[PDB]
Amino acid sequence: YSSDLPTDIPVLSKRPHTNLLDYTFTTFDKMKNWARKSSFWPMTFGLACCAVEMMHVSAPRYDQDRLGIIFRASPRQSDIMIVAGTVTNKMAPALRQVYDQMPYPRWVISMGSCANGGGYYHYSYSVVRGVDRIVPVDIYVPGCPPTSEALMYGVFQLQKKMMDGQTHRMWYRSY
Amino acid sequence: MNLEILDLSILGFYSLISSNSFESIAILVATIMPVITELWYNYSQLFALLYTLIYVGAVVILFVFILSVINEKEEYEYEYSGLFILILVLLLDDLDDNESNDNDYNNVYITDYADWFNNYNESDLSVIGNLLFTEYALLLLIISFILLMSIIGLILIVKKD
Amino acid sequence: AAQTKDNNDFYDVKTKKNDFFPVQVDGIESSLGKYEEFAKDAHEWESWNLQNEDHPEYPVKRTKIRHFTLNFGPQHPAAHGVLRLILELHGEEILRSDPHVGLLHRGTEKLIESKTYMQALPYFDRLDYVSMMTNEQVFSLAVEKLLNLEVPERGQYIRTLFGEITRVLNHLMSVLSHAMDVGALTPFLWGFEEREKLMEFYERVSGARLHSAYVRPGGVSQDLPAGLLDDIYMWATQFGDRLDETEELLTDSRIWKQRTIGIGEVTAEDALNYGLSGVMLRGSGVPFDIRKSQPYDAYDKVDFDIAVGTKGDCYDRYLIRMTEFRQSLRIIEQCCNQMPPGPVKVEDFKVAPPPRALMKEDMEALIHHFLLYTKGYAVPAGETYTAIEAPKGEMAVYVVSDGSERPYRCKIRAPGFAHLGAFDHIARGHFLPDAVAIIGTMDLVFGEVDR
Amino acid sequence: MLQDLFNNYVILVGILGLIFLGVNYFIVESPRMDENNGNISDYIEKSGPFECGFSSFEQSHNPIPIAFILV
Amino acid sequence: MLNNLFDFIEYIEYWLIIVAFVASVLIVVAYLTVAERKTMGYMQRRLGPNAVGYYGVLMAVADALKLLSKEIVLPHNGDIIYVMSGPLISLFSVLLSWAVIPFGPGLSLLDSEYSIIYLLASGSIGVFGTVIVGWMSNSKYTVLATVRTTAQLISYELVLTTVVFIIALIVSSLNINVIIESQYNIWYIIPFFPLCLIFFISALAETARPPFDNVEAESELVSGHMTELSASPFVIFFLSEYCSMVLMSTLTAIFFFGGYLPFSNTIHHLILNLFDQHSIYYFIIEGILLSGYLAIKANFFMFSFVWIRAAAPRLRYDLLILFCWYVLLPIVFAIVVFAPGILYCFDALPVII
Amino acid sequence: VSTFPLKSDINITKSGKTLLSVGQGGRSSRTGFTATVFGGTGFLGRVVVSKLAKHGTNVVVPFRNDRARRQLKVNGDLGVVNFVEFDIRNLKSIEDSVKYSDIVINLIGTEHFSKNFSIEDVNIGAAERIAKAAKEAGVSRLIHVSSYNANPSSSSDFYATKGIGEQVVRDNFGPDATIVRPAPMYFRNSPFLNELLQIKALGGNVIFKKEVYPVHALQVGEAIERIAFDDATAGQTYELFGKERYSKKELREMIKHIIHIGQRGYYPYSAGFYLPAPEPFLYAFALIRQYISSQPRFNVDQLKRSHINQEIDQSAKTFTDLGMVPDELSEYLYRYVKPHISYTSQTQNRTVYSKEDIEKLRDYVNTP
Ligand SMILES: CCCCCCCCCCCCCCCCCC(=O)OC[C@H](COP(=O)(O)OCCN)OC(=O)CCCCCCCCCCCCCCCCC
Ligand SMILES: NC(=O)C1=CN([C@@H]2O[C@H](COP(=O)(O)OP(=O)(O)OC[C@H]3O[C@@H](n4cnc5c(N)ncnc54)[C@H](OP(=O)(O)O)[C@@H]3O)[C@@H](O)[C@H]2O)C=CC1
Ligand SMILES: CCCCCCCCCCCC(=O)OC[C@H](COP(=O)(O)OCC[N+](C)(C)C)OC(=O)CCCCCCCCCCC
Ligand code: SF4
């Protein structure tokens, strides 16, 4: 039982493509990453005034549908959870249950000061000081409310992160 | 390889193990489908489509009645059965599948000789309509009379007022 | 009420009143003997049963099973935000509705008591978070009345001009989302571009698209930038066509009228008794408007009309909100023409902050600037109940002052809170899709409800 | 009238429907490649019914009155 | 090779024809989803999808591929029967209905004198697929959709079936291709304009499209029977619903607008006179023209399916039940008597030739 | 967990640093400790990270799966949980994970070998590299988790490599290395219980005959919390196991009655709840799937381990040395098999199995 681990093999995010199978699984990842980035389906989870700016992203001026963005009423059909509003202690168990009902892959966006850290109601007896206390957050959008362009910029950042996923090349090189 | 045998064996297996009412209406669908497909080939394509047109509409009305009556009874009632005895029962029923005991009628094949005397060729449905509306018009009118009775009958049974 | 031997929480034994003579039957016998001779074995014989199930007094223990309990919960598009609407359904007909609120309760009134009057103002922007500037106006009026101060003429017109711009913004959100819930998706998109044009007016004068802390006790935060009135007027010449095109799809549509006519009817007697106000009150035939009953902020110097319904249903309230659209546009035109010169805030530096240029040159201006932002301004002790004709209805604030710089108590009266309290009385007997229309016709924002 | 072409189409349609399910079963990454929350048969918080956030009474097998039964 | 390849292709030729036929239907269905979003966008003064593929031409691919790479939610892996039995039955019902749609004279996979019956019978099976999802389900929103789905079927099924029978009665034939050829001199839109409106209304009800979108009302039943569906089961149901939209749009072009018949007979002759009938290029162009005539008429009603969605609010299902039985059924039954009276009066009872 | 994990607010590490804890022991509190949890995205890792971060201890989580690390950050406040993208074949990445750490917990281990790593590389090579890197970084405490049947002379690859892993870690890091030998752990989504809950368990007659001493996973994570913050546990070996011995066949049948698979007599046999297969066939199927299936299946080594029962090293220490009473599987069995119940759904009455109910059910299973 002799083990000889190499010492200077770069991590996956730095590892270049050497053989033919690297390009094969990178092609597999990019086809999936493009599909999920293009078919960006958030869930209709408007809580407070942050939701109004979320509606104006669907407004004709910005037209989120032009990017492939469709809001779904069911957690089963949505892969993006946008927490747009204040999360109260009375609401926190409902938010966790809805998040758990989303099939993978799933991402969570925290929009506004309420969802980020509580904002104006940080020192309230009935307000959760950040939705990250309940669910993992992938991107935080600042503002009170964040503008329609501020939210779109955050979505673009998430789509940039999604396009860098290497799920199937990770199996080939890291597992 | 007659695959109709395998489909009926699967259908018969679930008939003995069906517990709730939803599985029973599923048995009905799993019965009409082999009938329609075996009618679509071989004997009569016309009545294979007629069976689909009429019975599928009856299935939906049957299904919507089940939603108003299910009362949790078969969701917790236990059944015992046993895998070995169920297979034994189906195996013995599989042994005898000769509906008739005229061996000559079942084993000797026959042919028909076509003729050109029928220059006016039309579908069987047109001939059925020709006789039903002329020769047996009384049957058609009585059937409408029965349909009228059903319409009145349904209202008086169901309507509260 | 109370557990009885014939009625408890788990089962009941109902016996209807008898509709036939109490016939006396004695000496039951057969051809072989008396009933008592065979009664021991008669339990196996159904023909020997002495009780008829058709009898009204036949004993039957029936388990008490709850109706179809559907949670119109927070994750539902029909609910305009967070609402756990619990419905007792018999099929789809509504028997009893239990609106559960507090999912957006953030203790705003508790937090206000720890803030100065200037610090407490931004909390009102987030109660009715589509009609932001009207929320600031009712709190500003309450503090001004307590302060015994009067806004100058130009300040009043600005709060009137943006008061109706706010009302147009609210009705755009209210009516189109109500139509979107019913099924009309296209009018929602048409009017939300008009919101973008009007929210640009919000951002031009304050720097915030939605939460513009512009209306403050003693006037407005800042004066209008140059060219705003021209841009407002240019929008005004075109907004008339947008309203007409909206009515092209709803007003005379037979599908829309079948979803609103006769739905959610409210009598004039019951509307007052449930504290309904605004379109809910005016839909039942009562011509009451706060802008006419108690004029405030230059509303007594503009000409406008109020639409009053007759049948008290959703369709009447839709028609009223469309008339209020045109009357608000009528007021906005007058404010543009009649905007006077002068200060936009009270000429009192002990309440209103001094100009920045004067702050950096005058000793007294610096002191007043320093103290207004560090300690705030004290308000004479007392209490007030100031109400304004909010787009949702009657919004009022009950502010208690103790002579300090922080309000002692700030009770916020929400028309949506009162409207939703009558949902059970209004939506009973209607079907499930009618509830969605009733929710939309009340113009419910749950930040206002759960303030 | 010959229907051999029709029979081939019906065979393809049946096979085509299984391809959509088979592709989806063989394309999705394994749970260990994802957050590794285990199999769906154990993730009861996900496989449970959807009630808009708040769990309610379980009335799967309760009677459902129908107002259009006569129709 | 060569000789063994030039007969292998002949051996597998008709499978390529079916595969091409399947691809032809799928392409229209795939881009109907893109067309609907683009059409509603401009009517709503937005743009619609234009950032997924060059000008949005890959929007359909991204939506399908992303959902095919999604987790399937079910109580257990062995429960693949429950959430797949419904959508598969619905998908098979609409795909088999396309077998009797002739893109040209005799260019249908299934030719029979009972094609009309097969069309209606196959479509009725798709209703059973929708009700399967509500199989003693624990989801209250799934259950409510099944009740509404049955109610809608009672509304349109009688009305839709009788309207098709009137067209068949006028031609005295239940063959779809015979119905198309019978419209050479007159398109049935002119004599039966009320029936075309009635057929389109029934088509909207059958597909659960707005203003009859009570099964999948987002503001009433979040997602209806699909609220518990994800990944492949959602795709198959989504594919089947849009396949019905194309099929019903194509049926409207067949029954009332002459099917594949040219808009102008003179223009059809001129274009084909440019090609030699002794070469295969004539029949390649001929198939393009005849199906192009069908495509233009079918695309108009697929446009109309989107058009009514962007212009009318949703109607309650109980109002729909009264609408069909009190209004549509008396009208269609009146016409089924009116039409034979006219034909017999002028000695014009139809025969098959 | 409790409300304050440390026995004192001032702790002096083996390297001489003085660490002061602040707060009462909540999310906003701190303990002054920074810990690195190798393999923190695994089954036991999430429990360990949750316990450490919930009291304010800074946790550094090396990871290779980007999606699996996201749920770990919820455990701690802002700045408490830190992530480093790492690979056991990248020496620099490992050295960055332990640079600021006072405690290093090595939870990296595997029962299978893949196209990139063998059993030796993960169980021995990875442990040695982590242990040696920790010492050069001056880490006060190192905690290594071996297996329950760790024996360098064992005929099983998993047990032998775990046994060698214990020795190679003590040589590199030094005598101050604490080694933990946990029994099979039961918990939500536990690998020990997932195999028993699988309806189609191929070769249950050959695999489910192993006898073990299952231990609660929450207690194993709790024990690691005790060991990390108690310097008196340095240099010792801990065998974590339950009091009651169980065979997988008894657990399999006990679970079958809890899930109510037997409500239909025919169903368990028809559904494939029993799949008797010869061991030579299972060896062939395990050998084939070692090079065809892309997901870790029942491999050859696990087939060998089915014939080896869990033997407890008496010389090693137990929960008693850490001042804990092992949890009984009968108490926690129902709550961890509850998600897999067929229908339940409060139809008539939930059958809640208590501590006494499970023990009685064990007698029924063994009753012929
Ligand atoms: C058509 C393709 C898509 C559908 C494929 C689904 C395949 C499932 C079996 C189809 C029916 C075959 C004949 C069985 C008769 C119906 C029996 C039944 O209830 O469905 C079987 C299904 C199996 O689950 P299981 O747990 O073993 O049964 C319950 C045990 N208490 O138990 C269930 O209750 C699940 C029912 C799910 C919904 C099925 C509705 C009926 C489907 C009929 C369409 C096919 C027509 C029949 C074709 C075969 C004919 C033998
Ligand atoms: N019933 C049980 O589970 C028992 C546990 N053990 C041992 O306890 C320890 C904890 O494992 P457990 O949580 O229970 O279950 P797991 O086997 O799923 O945990 C394995 C952990 O080690 C990581 N790992 C494995 N190989 C590598 C590798 N080449 N590179 C980097 N990381 C790797 C994994 O990271 P990643 O997830 O990102 O792949 C994972 O975090 C293991 O060493 C196990 O052998 C022993 C007896 C009983
Ligand atoms: C068969 C199943 C159905 C069809 C599915 C098709 C899905 C669409 C494809 C996804 C698109 C995508 O992902 O392209 C997006 C990516 C960009 O990736 P990025 O992350 O933005 O930058 C990272 C890439 N760099 C580092 C190079 C910038 O473009 C490419 O690199 C395209 C270049 C690859 C070669 C293209 C030509 C080769 C021929 C390809 C056609 C045969
Ligand atoms: S962050 Fe601001 S805009 Fe967003 S919900 Fe909270 S108060 Fe409203």
Short mmCIF file of C-alpha atoms in Angstrom, two decimals, chain E residues 126-327:
data_model
loop_
_atom_site.label_atom_id
_atom_site.label_comp_id
_atom_site.label_asym_id
_atom_site.label_seq_id
_atom_site.Cartn_x
_atom_site.Cartn_y
_atom_site.Cartn_z
CA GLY E 126 -55.15 13.04 -24.05
CA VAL E 127 -57.70 14.16 -21.47
CA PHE E 128 -57.08 10.95 -19.52
CA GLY E 129 -53.40 11.87 -19.26
CA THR E 130 -54.17 15.15 -17.49
CA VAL E 131 -56.43 13.56 -14.87
CA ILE E 132 -53.81 10.91 -14.06
CA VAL E 133 -51.60 13.48 -12.30
CA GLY E 134 -54.31 13.91 -9.68
CA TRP E 135 -54.00 10.30 -8.51
CA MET E 136 -55.16 10.61 -4.87
CA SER E 137 -52.50 13.31 -4.76
CA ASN E 138 -51.49 15.06 -1.54
CA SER E 139 -51.18 18.36 -3.46
CA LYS E 140 -54.36 20.40 -3.10
CA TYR E 141 -53.63 22.55 -6.16
CA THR E 142 -53.13 19.46 -8.32
CA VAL E 143 -56.50 18.11 -7.17
CA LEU E 144 -58.38 21.33 -7.97
CA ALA E 145 -56.98 21.34 -11.52
CA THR E 146 -58.26 17.81 -12.19
CA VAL E 147 -61.79 18.85 -11.24
CA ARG E 148 -61.55 21.85 -13.56
CA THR E 149 -60.04 19.71 -16.33
CA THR E 150 -63.03 17.35 -16.30
CA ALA E 151 -65.44 20.30 -16.32
CA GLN E 152 -63.79 21.80 -19.41
CA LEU E 153 -63.96 18.46 -21.24
CA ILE E 154 -67.74 18.33 -20.73
CA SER E 155 -67.91 21.82 -22.26
CA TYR E 156 -66.00 21.50 -25.54
CA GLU E 157 -66.21 17.78 -26.34
CA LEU E 158 -69.86 17.83 -27.43
CA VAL E 159 -69.46 21.15 -29.24
CA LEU E 160 -66.16 20.29 -30.93
CA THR E 161 -67.31 16.84 -32.07
CA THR E 162 -70.57 18.07 -33.60
CA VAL E 163 -68.91 20.89 -35.56
CA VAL E 164 -66.50 18.41 -37.17
CA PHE E 165 -69.47 16.15 -37.96
CA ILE E 166 -71.24 18.97 -39.82
CA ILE E 167 -68.22 19.42 -42.10
CA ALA E 168 -68.10 15.64 -42.59
CA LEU E 169 -71.85 15.63 -43.26
CA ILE E 170 -71.44 18.35 -45.90
CA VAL E 171 -68.90 16.16 -47.73
CA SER E 172 -70.54 12.84 -46.71
CA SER E 173 -67.08 11.55 -45.80
CA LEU E 174 -65.02 10.99 -42.64
CA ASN E 175 -61.72 11.12 -44.56
CA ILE E 176 -59.63 14.23 -43.88
CA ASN E 177 -57.99 14.24 -47.31
CA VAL E 178 -61.40 14.02 -49.01
CA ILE E 179 -62.59 16.99 -46.92
CA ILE E 180 -59.59 19.02 -48.10
CA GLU E 181 -60.18 18.24 -51.78
CA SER E 182 -63.89 19.06 -51.48
CA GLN E 183 -62.99 22.72 -50.84
CA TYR E 184 -61.48 23.36 -54.29
CA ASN E 185 -64.24 25.74 -55.41
CA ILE E 186 -65.34 27.14 -52.03
CA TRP E 187 -63.55 27.33 -48.69
CA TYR E 188 -65.85 26.30 -45.85
CA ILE E 189 -65.07 29.53 -43.98
CA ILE E 190 -67.60 31.34 -46.19
CA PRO E 191 -70.64 29.01 -45.82
CA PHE E 192 -69.78 28.11 -42.20
CA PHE E 193 -68.27 31.23 -40.68
CA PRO E 194 -70.20 30.66 -37.40
CA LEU E 195 -68.79 27.12 -37.21
CA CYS E 196 -65.21 28.33 -37.69
CA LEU E 197 -65.60 30.68 -34.71
CA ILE E 198 -67.21 27.86 -32.71
CA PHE E 199 -64.45 25.43 -33.72
CA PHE E 200 -61.75 27.90 -32.66
CA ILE E 201 -63.49 28.51 -29.32
CA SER E 202 -63.68 24.75 -28.75
CA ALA E 203 -60.03 24.45 -29.79
CA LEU E 204 -59.08 27.01 -27.14
CA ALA E 205 -61.11 25.11 -24.54
CA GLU E 206 -59.61 21.76 -25.56
CA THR E 207 -56.02 23.01 -25.24
CA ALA E 208 -56.82 24.84 -21.96
CA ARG E 209 -55.62 28.07 -23.60
CA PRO E 210 -56.82 31.51 -22.48
CA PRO E 211 -59.47 32.83 -22.13
CA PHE E 212 -60.22 29.22 -21.08
CA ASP E 213 -56.98 28.71 -19.12
CA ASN E 214 -58.67 27.58 -15.91
CA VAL E 215 -56.63 24.37 -15.61
CA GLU E 216 -53.30 26.21 -15.44
CA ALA E 217 -54.39 29.58 -14.01
CA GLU E 218 -51.30 30.99 -12.31
CA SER E 219 -53.38 33.44 -10.26
CA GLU E 220 -55.79 30.69 -9.15
CA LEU E 221 -53.98 27.31 -8.99
CA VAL E 222 -50.29 28.36 -9.13
CA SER E 223 -49.53 25.84 -11.89
CA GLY E 224 -52.52 23.49 -11.89
CA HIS E 225 -51.72 19.82 -12.42
CA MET E 226 -48.09 20.74 -13.21
CA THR E 227 -47.37 22.35 -9.82
CA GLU E 228 -45.71 19.11 -8.64
CA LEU E 229 -43.96 18.39 -11.95
CA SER E 230 -40.35 19.17 -12.82
CA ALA E 231 -37.68 18.23 -15.38
CA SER E 232 -38.86 15.64 -17.94
CA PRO E 233 -42.53 15.27 -16.80
CA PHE E 234 -42.93 19.04 -17.14
CA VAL E 235 -41.33 19.01 -20.61
CA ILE E 236 -43.55 16.20 -21.91
CA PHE E 237 -46.70 17.93 -20.68
CA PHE E 238 -45.40 21.25 -22.02
CA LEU E 239 -44.58 19.60 -25.35
CA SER E 240 -47.98 17.89 -25.55
CA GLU E 241 -49.90 21.10 -24.82
CA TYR E 242 -48.09 23.03 -27.56
CA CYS E 243 -48.35 20.08 -29.95
CA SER E 244 -52.12 20.36 -29.52
CA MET E 245 -51.96 24.08 -30.32
CA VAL E 246 -50.22 23.36 -33.63
CA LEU E 247 -52.59 20.46 -34.35
CA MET E 248 -55.73 22.50 -33.67
CA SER E 249 -54.35 25.42 -35.71
CA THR E 250 -53.66 23.02 -38.58
CA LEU E 251 -57.14 21.50 -38.22
CA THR E 252 -58.75 24.93 -38.54
CA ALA E 253 -56.83 25.47 -41.78
CA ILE E 254 -58.02 22.06 -43.02
CA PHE E 255 -61.72 22.22 -42.17
CA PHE E 256 -62.43 25.82 -43.20
CA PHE E 257 -59.55 27.13 -45.35
CA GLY E 258 -59.03 24.27 -47.80
CA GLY E 259 -56.03 22.72 -46.07
CA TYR E 260 -53.09 22.60 -48.48
CA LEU E 261 -55.03 24.02 -51.44
CA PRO E 262 -53.36 27.07 -53.03
CA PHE E 263 -54.50 30.58 -52.24
CA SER E 264 -54.45 31.35 -55.98
CA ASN E 265 -54.70 28.62 -58.61
CA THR E 266 -53.04 30.82 -61.26
CA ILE E 267 -49.95 31.48 -59.12
CA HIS E 268 -49.62 27.77 -58.29
CA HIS E 269 -49.53 26.82 -61.98
CA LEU E 270 -46.98 29.51 -62.88
CA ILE E 271 -44.47 28.47 -60.21
CA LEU E 272 -44.72 24.77 -61.10
CA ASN E 273 -44.41 25.51 -64.83
CA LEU E 274 -40.82 26.62 -64.11
CA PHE E 275 -39.91 23.02 -63.19
CA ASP E 276 -39.84 19.83 -65.24
CA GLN E 277 -42.26 17.12 -64.10
CA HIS E 278 -39.80 14.48 -65.35
CA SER E 279 -37.34 15.46 -62.59
CA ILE E 280 -37.62 15.06 -58.83
CA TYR E 281 -37.12 18.82 -58.38
CA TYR E 282 -40.75 19.40 -59.38
CA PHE E 283 -42.05 17.21 -56.55
CA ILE E 284 -39.67 18.77 -54.03
CA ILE E 285 -41.02 22.21 -54.94
CA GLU E 286 -44.59 20.88 -55.08
CA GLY E 287 -44.34 19.56 -51.52
CA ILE E 288 -42.92 22.89 -50.37
CA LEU E 289 -45.76 24.83 -52.01
CA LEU E 290 -48.60 22.58 -50.82
CA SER E 291 -47.26 22.45 -47.26
CA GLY E 292 -46.37 26.13 -47.52
CA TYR E 293 -50.04 26.84 -48.22
CA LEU E 294 -50.93 24.78 -45.15
CA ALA E 295 -48.18 26.46 -43.11
CA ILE E 296 -49.37 29.99 -43.89
CA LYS E 297 -52.94 29.16 -42.88
CA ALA E 298 -51.75 27.23 -39.82
CA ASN E 299 -49.34 29.98 -38.75
CA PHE E 300 -52.20 32.50 -38.87
CA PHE E 301 -54.22 30.53 -36.31
CA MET E 302 -51.13 29.87 -34.22
CA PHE E 303 -50.77 33.65 -34.34
CA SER E 304 -54.45 33.87 -33.37
CA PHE E 305 -53.84 31.52 -30.42
CA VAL E 306 -51.24 34.00 -29.17
CA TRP E 307 -53.40 36.95 -30.26
CA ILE E 308 -56.39 36.03 -28.10
CA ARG E 309 -54.11 35.38 -25.10
CA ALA E 310 -52.75 38.94 -25.30
CA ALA E 311 -56.21 40.52 -25.74
CA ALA E 312 -58.74 38.74 -23.50
CA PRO E 313 -58.98 38.04 -19.76
CA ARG E 314 -59.62 34.56 -18.39
CA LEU E 315 -63.19 33.27 -18.11
CA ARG E 316 -64.35 31.22 -15.12
CA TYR E 317 -64.88 27.53 -15.84
CA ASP E 318 -68.42 27.46 -14.43
CA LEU E 319 -69.27 30.29 -16.84
CA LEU E 320 -67.72 28.18 -19.61
CA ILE E 321 -70.02 25.25 -18.79
CA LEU E 322 -73.08 27.46 -19.20
CA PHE E 323 -71.56 29.02 -22.33
CA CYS E 324 -71.25 25.74 -24.26
CA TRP E 325 -74.50 24.06 -23.17
CA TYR E 326 -76.83 27.09 -23.36
CA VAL E 327 -75.33 28.80 -26.44
#
